[PDB]
Structures are given as structure tokens and as C-alpha cells.
Amino acid sequence: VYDLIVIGGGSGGMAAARRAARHNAKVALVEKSRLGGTCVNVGCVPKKIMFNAASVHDILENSRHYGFDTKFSFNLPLLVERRDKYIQRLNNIYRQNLSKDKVDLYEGTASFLEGRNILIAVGNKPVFPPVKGIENTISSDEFFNIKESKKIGIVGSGYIAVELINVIKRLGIDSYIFARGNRILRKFDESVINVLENDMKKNNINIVTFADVVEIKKVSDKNLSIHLSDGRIYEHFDHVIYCVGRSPDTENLKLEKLNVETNNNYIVVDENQRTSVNNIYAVGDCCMVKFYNVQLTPVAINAGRLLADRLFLKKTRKTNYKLIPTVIFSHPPIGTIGLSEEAAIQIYGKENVKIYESKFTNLFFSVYDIEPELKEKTYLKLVCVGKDELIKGLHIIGLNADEIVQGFAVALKMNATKKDFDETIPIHPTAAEEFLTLQ
Amino acid sequence: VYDLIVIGGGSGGMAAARRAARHNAKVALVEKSRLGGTCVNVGCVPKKIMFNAASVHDILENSRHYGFDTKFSFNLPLLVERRDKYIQRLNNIYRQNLSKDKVDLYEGTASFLEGRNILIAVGNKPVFPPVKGIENTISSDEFFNIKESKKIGIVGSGYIAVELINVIKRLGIDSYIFARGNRILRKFDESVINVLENDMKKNNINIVTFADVVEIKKVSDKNLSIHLSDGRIYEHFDHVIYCVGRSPDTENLKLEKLNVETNNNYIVVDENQRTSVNNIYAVGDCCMVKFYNVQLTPVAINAGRLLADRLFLKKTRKTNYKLIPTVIFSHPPIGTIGLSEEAAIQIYGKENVKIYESKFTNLFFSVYDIEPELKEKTYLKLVCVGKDELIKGLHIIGLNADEIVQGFAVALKMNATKKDFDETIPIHPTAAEEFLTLQ
């Protein structure tokens, strides 16, 4: 008999499993594919490696403005073996940590019908809509098998699509991204995105708006065509990638005969991650909290670790889904916490929203021998709601924006104000100091 | 008659000058060399450009682990013209901003004997001690004229010396840095420095401890020798650089006949930057506050801007010299705010100091085809004083540490605690998130 059996060795189950492990629980975790799940084998990890890759290509393409004489070629199959070489080592490490802490791992698909508290941690799996030609399509996952390609088309404009198209261009591949609305990234502040799109277009990424693909044709093998509902046609794609969204691995868990609730396959739970049925719990994007979903590795890490506590020491600590810092690893990258300027106004009203923003050029681009206004930009935004100016949203796009936000999030959670930032003496010279002089 | 005459168009005078400008003051500023002073023409700006340069060289030397075939040469004279090309454009811009805001600029040396409130902003100038051979030496400034060199020796181990030696190696130049104590950077946390030195030595930077140079010989032109007091001799240097420290440009201001006070050339002032003599004020590292000195661009920017206020709108706002975030642009870079673990214990006592630290490898180095333990490292430290654990010091050394700290400083000023950080959901995957899981 186990104190807790973990189903899902991805981000959530693992953390959960090892934490309870730490509190002396007899723990068991069963996995069917490689350990570390989505984030490790087909999300965050490789994605981030390919983002670094595309960063090296730009540095190589531009080293001449820094005194270097450079001639280089890129070979994607190599980036491929290095990167999978890496991934293979993590799985072994995870299985090592799993014996280090006394958890009894089991490889196999899990199914309900010996444990005292059973935790569902089976995240999603990709979504292919009923669209004509969809057979000729692949998913964000599959992209990680691509070692040859001259033209790629992505359908969607969510964060995965944009990160992927920017990584795709910067690897020598001709690139399109189809979007349903007026602009990609419809959920993020529109100014931050105006800068994103301007730069993408500057780098010849083709962005198509108001697109509804009603057909995916296959002239032949690796000669595909994308058909939109308005007359525009787009030919010659070796891969069309659908970045629709993802849905829980919930289909056959032999769950129904348990009256465990289900919205649209997502397992419902409470502040504590408890099911309708007690004993049985759920974290990871495979669930929905209420209802928030929120599919990010660190959130599922929080959840699982915190639960273990209510389960083994004390309840006190619960997961906060409010305030979730994000990084869109686009080119350039985007750091974003809290409300956009418009979300703010939908909540507190325009009479209460003041904004602070900046536009400048990273010092890195000083030697680039080109007209200033053509250098890659950096833009930031402070959205302030109230009277001594609480910061309800914080965003920036640029060189290293991925590394500048974490910290400001510690300050947004502490209800900091324009004035906290203003009394903060800045570090020079850095991109991040601009946040402190928005006067 | 002027409402305020600014002496010194460096960081402080300029900001001061334009701010008061903003409040409708009849302002005048006089400069003798190029505008933007130390930070722009011989400090922060070029230094930072050369740091980026050395960053491109490492990226080029290692692109192969990312799929690239790279063959490159470096040519320092080019980095030199690009970089001075840049600097020339800033001076023009500064002189443009100076007409934009209605300040009457005057080029010439300033000397006391028409203005209502006169502001001293003349920072330092380098220091060469009475040492034998010192004639054969140069200063951090002069380094910016160097376009040829096979071996360089730096005397000192302060932040400028370390930044400069790391930049020097990464430009193909053989490198030594002489230090008086046991380790370079004696003012910063010793663990953060153990990692710094290990990496420097890993990259063949030679670090010499307990060194007292008592002689600087010149066998010939660009064939110099460094003599230490203990028997060690070090030959074949084209340039020996002395990074001793800097002293105020105060020597002949025709000041004495004014009973304006002087410690060791530094002009003394108060919380408000007022002299012994009123009407006359002082910011910039050319002064000493009490007594803090603190020679950083953003501090002198604060001071000058804030003064203008007491001078033109209201006093309320004063400069805080307590809590000064810093970045040592070493390789790797170091972000540091607040107390070291030992400074903490000199203040609150060991019974009250808890520490949190981490050591890991940036994901950037995942594909480097080398044994893990040989990859460039990242190390962080939380120094906590008290009971719910106030963070009195925060440090990290690594890839992008320069960009991760600004933000945490907003949080240290807000007396954040381990637990503020702990409730902060992290961004993945990033170097900076490690700060949030130090459990």
C-alpha cells in the first residue's frame, strides 16, 4: 500500500512525488514515455535550446560590427543531435533523483480500477481540429523531428507559434504564420506587440491576418498549400504546423465510473487540488482550478509541491493562480507580468489608468553600422492603476527581456508603486534600468 | 545673471542642468573636454562595448556546439573605430539635448573668482602612486587608445581592473592581474568570488596574490617588467595599467579663498549637497556625502536631478546612498545588492544570519560537448538577517547576471523576505527563477 501514487512523471508529478518523498511518504510514480514529460522532451527545454541557437545565428551574422571576420554555415541536423543528446541525459538524471528520494517508479500506462492518495498528473496532448487537409499537418511536438526544410507555415498565433516561427526564420527557413485576428498575440499588450510584429517583418517573417484556413492541400510530398476562406492561397510548404492548443490526456483513464467531474476533459478541483472524489487529486495543466487552467511548468511544480504538504505536514500553504509572470521567447523576447493597458481599463476604468512607456536601442547595437532607426528596438510599459500608482501590469520586449522580469515580479507581488521603482537607484549601463527613470 | 551655473558636463552636471532647465531656471553649463565626461568617453560606455565584444568572441569560439561551422578572425583596430565612431555621436547628441532644453553651454575650463547657485560637477581623474617605474605605466583611461598588444598587466583588483582583465583575455591578449590580498574583489562576497577566480583561471587569466609591485622596469619599448616585493618577477608586458583609484578634479579651482571644505580633495556636503558655503553645491564622485563617496553614474544622475528640485520646486526629495545595486561586468558578470554574508555578520552577528545559495549551469551550455563539471557556472546567494528573513544582501555571478539584478533591487528596497520570493511564481526556463526555489 502506498501513501500516494503519482500518475504522470512530468513537471507536476515529479515535484509532487519527490516533495512528499521528503516528508517520508511511501511514494509511487508510474510513467509511460520518457520522464520529465512535455516541458523536458517536447516543450520548454528543446524550445529554449533552439531559441539560443537562433540567438547564435544572429550573433554570427553580425559579428563584423564588433571587429570580427566571420564566415559560417549552419547545419540543422547537428543542432538536432546535440540537443537530443542533451535531452537523453535529463531522463536519466530524473530517474536518478527518483531513487535518491525513495520513490518506487513504475513504467507503464496508468489506469483506474494500491495507494491511499492518488494524484493525476497527465497534462495535455496536441489538438487537431476538423479541418480539410488536416491529415497533411503536424504539431508543435513533431517539429522536434524536423532536420530538413526550406519553407514552414504555422497556423495559430499563440505564444508557441510565435516563438516557433521566430526560431524557424533564424534557422534559414522561409516563414509564415497565419493568424485569425488583426495581430498575433491578441492576449498581450498591443504596443508591445506592435514592436514584435515590426521587427518580425523587418526580419522577413510573413504575418497574415484575418486568416481562416479551410483547406490543407498536398500537391505532393513536401509541396503543400494553405487555403484561406477569403481567396488568399499560399503554396510550397514542406511542413504546415498546427498550433491550435492542447487538451488533457484524460480520454481513457477508466474514470467515469467514479463520477469525477469533467468540463471538457479537464479535471476540476479546488484551491487544494481535490477532486469531487477525495483521496484523488490533480495538478498540471491536465486540470482546471476553481476555473483557471494555466499551462506553465512552474505552476504545476508549485501545485504538486504544495499539495504534498497539506498531505503530509500542514495545509496552510495554497497555490496562487493570480499574478503569473510570463516570458514569450519570441525574437525579441517579451517579459510580461500582470495586466495589459487595455485589460486594466476593462477592470478599473480609463479614468484610473496611467501608463509609462519607453523606446530605446540596447547598447549592444551601438556598433552595428546602420542608421539608428533601423536597429532592433527595446520598448517598455508600466501600467498604473490608482492614486499612488500601483503597478498592475509590467511588460517589455527586447534583448534579454527574458532575464529582466523575474525580479520585478517579486515587486509586483508586493504591491510596489511607480515611486518604489523611482526610489530605486538604477544599475548602469543596462536595459533594465530604464524601468527606473520612466519619468 | 544665471539662476544656476553647472561646472562639469559629465553625468551629474548634465542631468542637473537639464532638470533645473525643466523647472524654468536660467541655466548655464561649461565644459572643457567632450560632453558626457568619464562615463561616456572613458568609462561605462566604451567599457560596456568592449564587454559585448568579448561576449561575441566567446559566442564565435563556441558556435560549433550549436550546429555552426565557424572560422573567424578578430581585428582590434576595427572594434576601435566602430566604438569611437559611436562615442563621437553621443557628444553631438548631448550638445543637442543641451539646446533642446534652453541651457547656455560654454566650453572652457571653469574657475572661481555670473550665477546665483553654482554646482561643482567635476568627478575624478586617475591616480598614479609614488612607485618606482610608474613613469612606464598607463591608466585605465589610456587603455582606450590601445589598438595593438600581446601581453597586458593590470595592477589593482578593484572592479575596473577585473572587468578590464576579463575583457583583455577575451580579445586574444595574454593576461595578468596583480592583487595585494588573497583574492581579487576583497569587497565582495567571497563565494561569489571563488567562482569568478575559478572561471578566470579556467580561461587562463593569471591572478597573482599578495603582490606589492615596488618597481616598474622598461627593458625597451613595449618590453616591460613588473617587480614584486617578495622575489617574484614578471616579464614581457607591452602595457602595465595601474588601476589604483581616482581623485577629484579639484586641484586648481581657485577654491581655497572660499573656505569651502576639503577632506583629501573631495568636496564635503550634506544630505542636500550643500557646501560649507551656501549658494555653492556639489554632486558627482568629485564630492563626498556626509561621508559616502560612491562613484557610479546613476548616483550622480540622482543627486543632480534631485537637487534641481530643492532649488526650483520643493526640497522634499533627497538622495539615498544606502542600498546601491551594482554590476561588475566581469566574465562572468556579477550582480550585487546589499551585504555580503560576512558584512552581515559584522553587523547583526552570526546567530542572526542565514544564507541561501545555488550552483548550476545555464541551459545555454547544455549543448557544449564537454563534461558537465567543466561548463561555465552560475552561483547565487541569499543573505538573510532576522526572523522572517529579511534579505540584506543579494548576489549572483553568471550569464546575464547583469540583467537579472535591477529588479530584485526594487524588492530589497521594499524589505522583501525569503517568503516574498517564495510566493513568487517563477518564470521558466531562466537563470533568474533559481532565486525563487532556494529551498
Curated annotation (Swiss-Prot), chains A, B:
**According to the UniProt record, what class of enzyme is this?**
oxidoreductase
This entry's Enzyme Commission designation comes to 1.8.1.7
Q: Which residues bind NADP(+)?
A: I160, E163, R180, R186, G245, V327
Temperature dependence per UniProt: Inactive at 80 degrees Celsius.
User: Which pairs of Cys residues are joined through disulfide bonds in the record?
Assistant: C39-C44
Q: Which GO terms describe its molecular function?
A: flavin adenine dinucleotide binding; glutathione-disulfide reductase (NADPH) activity
Report the sequence similarity comment from the record. Answer: Belongs to the class-I pyridine nucleotide-disulfide oxidoreductase family.
Its biological purpose is as follows:
Catalyzes the reduction of glutathione disulfide (GSSG) to reduced glutathione (GSH). Constitutes the major mechanism to maintain a high GSH:GSSG ratio in the cytosol.
The record's subunit annotation is: Homodimer.
What is the protein name for this chain? Glutathione reductase
